[PDB]
Design a protein around this ligand. Structure first.
Ligand SMILES: CSC[C@H]1O[C@@H](n2cnc3c(N)ncnc32)[C@H](O)[C@@H]1O
Ligand SMILES: [Zn+2]
Ligand SMILES: [Zn+2]
Lengths: 115, 301
């Protein structure tokens, strides 16, 4: 009953003061987009950066299997929007946060479905 | 000039018509660096300007478009150029990329290995190559036409580029091939494009626009590369990242260009005219199927 828990590893690594994963691929864009979290094309608004999805996925970047049971990746081949205040660590951001299944914004970073 | 607000500079037609001798490339703003927008990698900026320039040509853009991208890896293990290509290309475009070394990609499918191992059943609407071996930047050796992956690319274009399709193949002073230049004569139009963010380098993208599958002009590849270097040697290009700040018109317009399957005999002058205008793609519309040849070796004593 053993699989490696890379998500926990990275979180503990960050908490100890580890340098976040670099070389996430930031895109040029207008920054006038919808601001939803994971999109088929860059959608940053004025308070986000847009990144190549694969380069921001912990599993992709670590060459490890995806926790999805069919191995599918949520980010690869799409673009993830990251709050500019978190753009220093896009992998950490996508790991630690969650997309609202209703409006497609990051819970706590655009999702206003609790009003 | 006004060049600084463009994404780059294309080889003026007058230089293409010369008959120069190959000289060493000595760039005036050698060593200069463009100031990149905060946090943007050189290869994102370089591919964006390449794509901004391609927007000005007459590319065929069919439904079910297929694009193959060689040399897509980086020493960072990611694929910045693939990410820009997928941003640029219409949503749903089939994007395959490849490199000698492993990398993680946003492409629909990635093949790792030497490009000569790569085979595809289907034809392609656009071929992009950033393949480059830095050991060619040897200023102490004669500068001869190179083979290697350039030999692969020439055969790949002739065998698997759809009529009406286009290519952009990165070259440098030392990384070039005479037959590739000659093959540019098989497109309705061609140029060598230098991006403004990398204008201090002898890099350019050899662009062939709308493939005709036959000589439209006869081009001597050794002379043409000498013409290109002569252009670079006498036309300093001001480093510029101005065009990176205007992304409003960046995505490639899905033109829904027509695709027909046709046999050799059916290609009349009317067809060739439409191919030349970016109004027609000739290939099968079958499944995209790719593979990579793997050499098997048993190292056990
Ligand atoms: C973007 S830097 C140039 C890239 O081209 C790749 N490359 C160079 N020569 C070949 C080749 N023969 N086949 C595949 N990729 C190549 C290198 O591995 C590097 O990632
Ligand atoms: Zn992934
Ligand atoms: Zn919501």
């Amino acid at each position: 009953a053993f699989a490696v828990d890379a998500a926990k590893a990275y979180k503990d690594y960050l908490a100890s003061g580890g340098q976040p994963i670099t070389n996430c691929v930031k895109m040029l864009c207008t920054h006038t987009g919808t601001g939803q979290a994971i999109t088929v094309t860059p959608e940053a608004n004025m308070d986000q950066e847009s990144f190549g999805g694969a380069s921001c996925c912990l599993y992709c970047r670590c060459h490890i299997d995806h926790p999805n049971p069919k191995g599918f990746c949520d980010l690869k081949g799409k673009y993830v929007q990251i709050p500019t205040t978190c753009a220093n660590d896009p992998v950490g951001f996508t790991l630690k946060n969650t997309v609202c299944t209703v409006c497609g914004m990051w819970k706590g970073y655009g999702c206003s479905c609790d009003q | 000039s006004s060049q600084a607000w463009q994404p780059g500079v294309a080889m003026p037609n007058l230089y293409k018509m010369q008959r120069m001798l190959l000289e060493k490339c000595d760039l005036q703003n050698y060593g200069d660096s463009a100031t990149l927008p905060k946090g943007i990698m050189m290869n994102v900026a370089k591919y964006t300007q390449l794509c901004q320039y391609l927007n000005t040509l007459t590319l065929a853009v069919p439904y079910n478009m297929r694009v193959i991208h060689f040399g897509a890896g980086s020493d960072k293990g990611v694929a910045p150029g693939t990410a820009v290509l997928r941003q640029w290309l219409p949503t749903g475009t089939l994007l395959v990329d490849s490199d000698l070394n492993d990398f993680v990609s946003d492409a629909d499918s990635t093949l790792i290995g030497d490009c000569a191992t790569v085979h595809t059943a289907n034809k392609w609407d656009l071929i992009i190559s950033d393949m480059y071996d830095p050991k060619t930047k040897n200023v102490t050796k004669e500068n001869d036409s190179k083979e290697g992956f350039f030999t692969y690319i020439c055969g790949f274009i002739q065998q698997k580029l759809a009529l009406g399709g286009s290519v952009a193949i990165k070259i440098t002073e030392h990384s070039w091939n005479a037959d590739l230049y000659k093959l540019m004569g098989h497109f309705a139009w061609w140029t060598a494009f230098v991006t403004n963010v990398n204008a201090s380098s002898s890099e350019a993208f050899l662009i062939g626009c709308n493939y005709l599958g036959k000589p439209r002009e006869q081009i001597d590849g050794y002379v043409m590369h000498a013409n290109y270097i002569f252009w670079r040697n006498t036309n300093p290009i001001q480093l510029s990242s101005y065009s990176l700040f205007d992304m409003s018109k960046f995505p490639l317009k899905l033109r829904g260009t027509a695709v027909m399957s046709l046999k050799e005999g059916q290609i009349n002058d009317m067809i060739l005219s439409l191919l030349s205008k970016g109004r027609l793609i000739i290939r099968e519309n079958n499944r995209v199927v790719i593979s990579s040849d793997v050499l098997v070796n048993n190292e056990n004593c």
